[PDB]
């Protein structure tokens, strides 16, 4: 549907996005993904309304990428979110909006620190140790604030995401088809599949 | 006698930049084109200014669409704008009428483009600061007149020729076309005629890295002959004069 | 100008005098044409003076 | 308030033959229940053995016959007295309709003529854009009356050979120019007695390899 | 002298010289002869090739279903004004359902050439058209001068050696007005008119381009073997 | 309406119906829902008829000026991505769209894209779009096979539209199948649905809820 | 003669005869007299076919 | 139309900008004007000049109020001053009286009118303005301050200076008579004394236009009872009042 | 503005183009030689003037993408105007058709920019000439093009542009063989370095070499590596 | 005619070259001297006014030191009026990059933007150049202190030490003989006063003709502090170095 989650752990940002797209009264792809690289250590998962998601994903991509060749300097994940928000705010005021919610998870090279930013369609960034969007967000939150410790290793953040997933299968009134997880480490952006 | 305009006359009555523009077609490198009954042949002296030049990826023949091809001579940067417009133009007509545009009608569009310098006046929005100085040999095939070959000038006037040369070797080339041409020649005998007249005004050596042939046939559309066929054909000219 | 074509002929022999050749070659006239025509085209009277003619 | 589209009824019928083509229509113009005009053509010749009718709402329907003939003109001017094909004209009509798509026309267009093979060809457009080639397509308000009776006498639609009970379908045949006069006149005879936007007059244009013939028949006078 | 550079600078002789210069484009141009009766107008143009391999350049442009024009100046200049005349002929049929009067069409033409000659960064149009047509007061022959000036004549010429043509028309002046209904005779009277503007170039089935318009004949261009009866 | 396409080992089978209704009234039974964009692309017709018919002739205009400039044949992914950005502009003017651009190239393999009015673009392996896209999925997805012959696939495309056509109000007329190969689309012609049906009722022995 | 002065018009008379003189004629012909108008005038580079 | 979009100030070949150099010639043709900065006021001074005595001097103005806290006085061309005074009032309201609600500081307003200068040392179809202005004023954080805005478009802060045809002689007199405590009343005695040596024509309280930017007068405020605001600091001296201080030489 | 600054000459030219060509010669010198599997654009860098930084002072060769490098000779001021457009067109390519640029395409676009400024009212044309080089994506044929102020581009097997370009190109006719490129990448560095030390001279402190290998490998050599190739060549010679 | 009065500021000469950019630089050689030295613990910026007078207020003047943003100040040498415009542009652009990325603008970005602006006027518009020369002192985390000079051509070059304005040849030679890589701000303070002392045209150098500012990382909490020294501290530091 529209489920994107963020779990910031102390060495990795773990963004996972949905494998289902629903347009019309049936599922058209049940094997899909919904994430675009910004930087080689900045990852943006996006989800929300019909057809704003792709077109606003690639717009922002052209832009961060332009800078990053030009100056052969990565941006801070902090920098990156400011730009995305700047664009989102502006579109409410302009004729045609973009209703899309984005989690930008990156690993800063300067400070050596994960940072997770949650930007809503209105355009407010806010730094979080963990964050979600939609109604999916409700189920998940209450688990993260019980069991989270800010001293986590990579694997601990993965095993936590299993609880969140297990909960979602039960309560969620709709299908979503598992998630591709992506780990934004300091070496690359490496993909693993959760079971 | 005077020239401190941009679009001005001339005691004679021609436009002035246009007069100069035609004399920069004497600094082209040849495009020759014989139209016969079975098709139109276009050949060009490709030119190499150094042998550290890759001369097989510089080409001065360009396909406008399947059934209209073109050979360009004069300054090729000017030719970059007009050939784009031409591509665009042909496409528009297939859009609007789902019909393969006539050659004449195509030529006529591109002449209207060559006159559009000025400081912004008339009904045609000036945006050029000086006119083009490239001439085109619009080749092509229509289902109304068969095979046709046009010579488009940077004046803005277009004539259908049966054979024409343009470039630095024009004078010495069209003096020969006059004598040697007749009403009907079969297509591979046209290709050899292109290579014979291209050879007299040649300032190099006739070989396949500095001559390019191309045809237009109805059945095959516009095909630019590979170096394998251009080489063979060259060899059959040095053989055929060798029986004379 | 017919005056440039004179400079061409004089410089075609000047390259023979320099090469120790006594009878001209097509090669000596090519050298001549490049130096006289390319070099002195910057200094061409043709361009400025044509504006009156 | 301004409600800028009305209607003027009318009914038209296009039949593609095999050496001729038939584009016909009635000549009655209406607004509501009052008869405005008994006689008023809608089936205009455009030359080049194309007949067009842009039928429905009249004010749109005259606009696309104006704008259409204007392009027949400007084609003949810039292509050295070129003969306008059915193919060319069709795709051009498509552009003229489609260009207003934020304020559409509200007419049903149909063209007819010969194609380039010496057979009839009829293309029929919806107001928005698209088109397809036909052998019958009615339009207008008594469309749904006239179409299914033409599919049963031309294409032999759901008829089988006598006493074969579903084994072999009935064979198609060629219809003469003469026969097709009877089919079109008979449809509108039946149409008048069951519909109240058709009558007074019927103007068939028949297109051949010699010219266009108008042939005028009366219908019931209500 | 210094007065010749632009289109804004008068001129001590009362002139402007550039319009004067554009009038010499008509003179270096090829001949076309017009003559009219009281029922048919004729343009008799002599077409011009460059070389033997060359085609001949169309000199008569059918402007409408009852109008035709012929150039005797710049070919690019003629293309601009011809569109403008078609445009105003089609705007009259659309808006007022009226065949554009011949007398009115010289005034519409007029002002398009004046407004680029009064303006800076423009130029005059160096082409003269002879415009025939048959409207509601009959046949008309207009001569459009690149000066902007329109005049209405019974027969005229422009081109090179054109004066020799005006004379043929000047002699045969009281004859041709009185032959009506017989387009054969007007055409022949116009072929002979343009033949005194020769000087070893002749006339053939690829030189002569005739177009007529009649009361009883809409606009027809004859060429090919259809000008082979009328040499 | 119901138009489906599936990649298998030969290329993509495209399969379309020809019934274009106005609602209760059936407008025409011979409406082509295949659009030859060039010789290596076909586009299906779904949603607004007019919108798809127009813009995919006009994609043909951008296919031929891609082809000329690069002197190389267009990518299927590039083709899709022209069209996408065009319908994004006219979104909120409310023009409806449903197209599958189907192509097969030699530098990417068989690739389907589904271009939609939203700006939504999804590549894939099976799609069905229409007002009877639900019927079609059922048969096609059970009997799915990657490793399939050209002969079996042609019968499978037919059969899928058939099932949809029988229950769907707005499906019928005739079906038309194309098989897109590398070297071009090959047309497999026109089969009536109402005549296909009785053949397939005897041979298979399907439809025991249908009189006969 | 259009904007010729009476000195220019004297010039056309002499010029006409010179052209006859070359042909070798014993009279000046009408053909030659017009030819002399065109020779008195500076424009005598004539057509280039950009007036066709 | 307009086709003049090319600058008529162009680089001269041995360096310098030729129009701005020329325009400074036109500054030194005109009247003589001076300003003295005290510790509590600034005085500015100029001489009136007419075609004949038939002109009135009463309706003439050469010292203008741009804001109540900032006045200007020129030496150079009459026409150019006249429009540039009006453009100065305009940008002073539009860019600080609608944005920060109050009159702008003297440093800021000076900086805006130097940018008005600048966009006629550049752009097409324009030459430089032919005035040099003293723009004296008072702001709350740089004190009393006197500036000289010039045809170049530069500004210089000053403590006393002179511009106009008697500029050379005036400033030497003023260099030697300056002191690091002056009162505003003591400032006046300098400025009058200097302006008397640059006049050779008639000398009166009607032909010397004198202005002080002293300290606040609530009698020109127009109203009473908001104590937050404090009346015109700018105050042009009437002919009667100037005449006493003339006798005081 | 709207006045022409490029106008037709009574000869057959435009004086602003001939002039612009004169402008490329008064610039510094960039050399191009491609190996079997490398491009090498090396450029002469100034150091008449001293106390000049090395880290923060821009280089002569500016990476457009990860696989297309551009070098320029002529006015060092103008250069940055052609490159700003060229970088944005590359990202537009990625957007609208997908795939990153092909070297032929970027060269044709860059040519179209200079082409336009030779014929648009109120511009002079650029006095700057490029060696635009790189790899096609998913291929490994080296591509080396050079475009010039006319707005004309040429592909070259090896080429050289800037001051004394005729003197350097003469050298390259005699040592680079069209048939057999330098057998490895390393042999190709020794050729570009061998060429430069003719005109540039004055140590290895002026020589810059950017080497590209296929699959998006851009490396710009350090002063130490340069010294090493100059020394070998000096000694062998 | 309008064309009659056009300068044509922006064609080339026969040399290949731009008269009006060359002349612009001619006039900046008249203007005030400004030198910048990048120490390894600061940048010292010092410029000597081209005019002086004793009635001239020179105590709160800052007509050579202008701050662009919190971490980047420039020294000005040229047409001050032209510079005031681009200083106020620069200030708009620097603040802009901070608004949209929430990140301190790098020295490289602001310097390149200003260069291209100058560059627009020599390229097109038919307008005179902006004759300004900036020395940029700036800090960024990335490359530490960065030092830069820009010319009217709209070209930027890095420096470690540089001098623009009057007496460029003289100042440049002096810096080079003294400059070491191991220098802190104290050595830099001494050199900046000292080169200015050798190029001076006054009988002795004094504080009222010096404007002087530094940017030190040696300010508290590992922060860059921009200090434009007051003329009474400049007079103090002038007693220390024993110039007076």
mmCIF file with all atom_site columns, N, CA, C and O in Angstrom, chain B residues 29-33 43-45 71-73 137 164-167:
data_model
loop_
_atom_site.group_PDB
_atom_site.id
_atom_site.type_symbol
_atom_site.label_atom_id
_atom_site.label_alt_id
_atom_site.label_comp_id
_atom_site.label_asym_id
_atom_site.label_entity_id
_atom_site.label_seq_id
_atom_site.pdbx_PDB_ins_code
_atom_site.Cartn_x
_atom_site.Cartn_y
_atom_site.Cartn_z
_atom_site.occupancy
_atom_site.B_iso_or_equiv
_atom_site.pdbx_formal_charge
_atom_site.auth_seq_id
_atom_site.auth_comp_id
_atom_site.auth_asym_id
_atom_site.auth_atom_id
_atom_site.pdbx_PDB_model_num
ATOM 1  N N  . UNK B 1 29  ? 32.989 21.436 -48.978 1.00 0.00 ? 29  UNK B N  1
ATOM 2  C CA . UNK B 1 29  ? 33.608 20.315 -49.539 1.00 0.00 ? 29  UNK B CA 1
ATOM 3  C C  . UNK B 1 29  ? 32.571 19.531 -50.167 1.00 0.00 ? 29  UNK B C  1
ATOM 4  O O  . UNK B 1 29  ? 31.466 19.488 -49.604 1.00 0.00 ? 29  UNK B O  1
ATOM 5  N N  . UNK B 1 30  ? 32.833 18.992 -51.428 1.00 0.00 ? 30  UNK B N  1
ATOM 6  C CA . UNK B 1 30  ? 31.760 18.629 -52.366 1.00 0.00 ? 30  UNK B CA 1
ATOM 7  C C  . UNK B 1 30  ? 30.661 17.671 -51.883 1.00 0.00 ? 30  UNK B C  1
ATOM 8  O O  . UNK B 1 30  ? 30.955 16.644 -51.274 1.00 0.00 ? 30  UNK B O  1
ATOM 9  N N  . UNK B 1 31  ? 29.449 17.945 -52.287 1.00 0.00 ? 31  UNK B N  1
ATOM 10 C CA . UNK B 1 31  ? 28.375 16.996 -52.286 1.00 0.00 ? 31  UNK B CA 1
ATOM 11 C C  . UNK B 1 31  ? 27.939 16.971 -53.729 1.00 0.00 ? 31  UNK B C  1
ATOM 12 O O  . UNK B 1 31  ? 27.519 18.011 -54.222 1.00 0.00 ? 31  UNK B O  1
ATOM 13 N N  . UNK B 1 32  ? 27.882 15.781 -54.392 1.00 0.00 ? 32  UNK B N  1
ATOM 14 C CA . UNK B 1 32  ? 27.446 15.599 -55.780 1.00 0.00 ? 32  UNK B CA 1
ATOM 15 C C  . UNK B 1 32  ? 26.239 14.707 -55.768 1.00 0.00 ? 32  UNK B C  1
ATOM 16 O O  . UNK B 1 32  ? 26.108 13.899 -54.892 1.00 0.00 ? 32  UNK B O  1
ATOM 17 N N  . UNK B 1 33  ? 25.282 14.869 -56.752 1.00 0.00 ? 33  UNK B N  1
ATOM 18 C CA . UNK B 1 33  ? 24.024 14.172 -56.642 1.00 0.00 ? 33  UNK B CA 1
ATOM 19 C C  . UNK B 1 33  ? 23.557 14.111 -58.065 1.00 0.00 ? 33  UNK B C  1
ATOM 20 O O  . UNK B 1 33  ? 23.433 15.176 -58.694 1.00 0.00 ? 33  UNK B O  1
ATOM 21 N N  . UNK B 1 43  ? 26.969 11.292 -53.341 1.00 0.00 ? 43  UNK B N  1
ATOM 22 C CA . UNK B 1 43  ? 28.276 11.150 -52.873 1.00 0.00 ? 43  UNK B CA 1
ATOM 23 C C  . UNK B 1 43  ? 28.871 12.443 -52.459 1.00 0.00 ? 43  UNK B C  1
ATOM 24 O O  . UNK B 1 43  ? 28.527 13.554 -52.859 1.00 0.00 ? 43  UNK B O  1
ATOM 25 N N  . UNK B 1 44  ? 29.855 12.327 -51.609 1.00 0.00 ? 44  UNK B N  1
ATOM 26 C CA . UNK B 1 44  ? 30.540 13.434 -50.887 1.00 0.00 ? 44  UNK B CA 1
ATOM 27 C C  . UNK B 1 44  ? 31.939 13.050 -50.734 1.00 0.00 ? 44  UNK B C  1
ATOM 28 O O  . UNK B 1 44  ? 32.286 11.879 -50.755 1.00 0.00 ? 44  UNK B O  1
ATOM 29 N N  . UNK B 1 45  ? 32.879 14.068 -50.740 1.00 0.00 ? 45  UNK B N  1
ATOM 30 C CA . UNK B 1 45  ? 34.290 14.007 -50.470 1.00 0.00 ? 45  UNK B CA 1
ATOM 31 C C  . UNK B 1 45  ? 34.130 14.300 -49.044 1.00 0.00 ? 45  UNK B C  1
ATOM 32 O O  . UNK B 1 45  ? 33.641 15.374 -48.701 1.00 0.00 ? 45  UNK B O  1
ATOM 33 N N  . UNK B 1 71  ? 22.381 15.670 -48.413 1.00 0.00 ? 71  UNK B N  1
ATOM 34 C CA . UNK B 1 71  ? 23.862 15.747 -48.413 1.00 0.00 ? 71  UNK B CA 1
ATOM 35 C C  . UNK B 1 71  ? 24.166 17.162 -48.197 1.00 0.00 ? 71  UNK B C  1
ATOM 36 O O  . UNK B 1 71  ? 23.532 17.990 -48.859 1.00 0.00 ? 71  UNK B O  1
ATOM 37 N N  . UNK B 1 72  ? 25.038 17.526 -47.243 1.00 0.00 ? 72  UNK B N  1
ATOM 38 C CA . UNK B 1 72  ? 25.254 18.891 -46.848 1.00 0.00 ? 72  UNK B CA 1
ATOM 39 C C  . UNK B 1 72  ? 26.695 19.365 -47.086 1.00 0.00 ? 72  UNK B C  1
ATOM 40 O O  . UNK B 1 72  ? 27.657 18.624 -46.987 1.00 0.00 ? 72  UNK B O  1
ATOM 41 N N  . UNK B 1 73  ? 26.921 20.655 -47.546 1.00 0.00 ? 73  UNK B N  1
ATOM 42 C CA . UNK B 1 73  ? 28.187 21.242 -47.908 1.00 0.00 ? 73  UNK B CA 1
ATOM 43 C C  . UNK B 1 73  ? 28.244 22.733 -47.696 1.00 0.00 ? 73  UNK B C  1
ATOM 44 O O  . UNK B 1 73  ? 27.299 23.462 -47.973 1.00 0.00 ? 73  UNK B O  1
ATOM 45 N N  . UNK B 1 137 ? 21.332 19.365 -50.586 1.00 0.00 ? 137 UNK B N  1
ATOM 46 C CA . UNK B 1 137 ? 20.877 18.644 -51.770 1.00 0.00 ? 137 UNK B CA 1
ATOM 47 C C  . UNK B 1 137 ? 19.927 17.715 -51.113 1.00 0.00 ? 137 UNK B C  1
ATOM 48 O O  . UNK B 1 137 ? 20.192 16.576 -50.804 1.00 0.00 ? 137 UNK B O  1
ATOM 49 N N  . UNK B 1 164 ? 23.750 18.134 -59.984 1.00 0.00 ? 164 UNK B N  1
ATOM 50 C CA . UNK B 1 164 ? 24.253 19.408 -59.543 1.00 0.00 ? 164 UNK B CA 1
ATOM 51 C C  . UNK B 1 164 ? 25.421 19.011 -58.692 1.00 0.00 ? 164 UNK B C  1
ATOM 52 O O  . UNK B 1 164 ? 25.325 17.939 -57.980 1.00 0.00 ? 164 UNK B O  1
ATOM 53 N N  . UNK B 1 165 ? 26.445 19.874 -58.687 1.00 0.00 ? 165 UNK B N  1
ATOM 54 C CA . UNK B 1 165 ? 27.449 19.816 -57.650 1.00 0.00 ? 165 UNK B CA 1
ATOM 55 C C  . UNK B 1 165 ? 27.466 21.159 -56.985 1.00 0.00 ? 165 UNK B C  1
ATOM 56 O O  . UNK B 1 165 ? 27.092 22.198 -57.536 1.00 0.00 ? 165 UNK B O  1
ATOM 57 N N  . UNK B 1 166 ? 27.894 21.069 -55.706 1.00 0.00 ? 166 UNK B N  1
ATOM 58 C CA . UNK B 1 166 ? 27.985 22.209 -54.870 1.00 0.00 ? 166 UNK B CA 1
ATOM 59 C C  . UNK B 1 166 ? 29.316 21.961 -54.277 1.00 0.00 ? 166 UNK B C  1
ATOM 60 O O  . UNK B 1 166 ? 29.775 20.840 -54.208 1.00 0.00 ? 166 UNK B O  1
ATOM 61 N N  . UNK B 1 167 ? 30.011 23.026 -53.856 1.00 0.00 ? 167 UNK B N  1
ATOM 62 C CA . UNK B 1 167 ? 31.265 22.954 -53.073 1.00 0.00 ? 167 UNK B CA 1
ATOM 63 C C  . UNK B 1 167 ? 32.306 23.754 -53.844 1.00 0.00 ? 167 UNK B C  1
ATOM 64 O O  . UNK B 1 167 ? 31.956 24.480 -54.745 1.00 0.00 ? 167 UNK B O  1
#
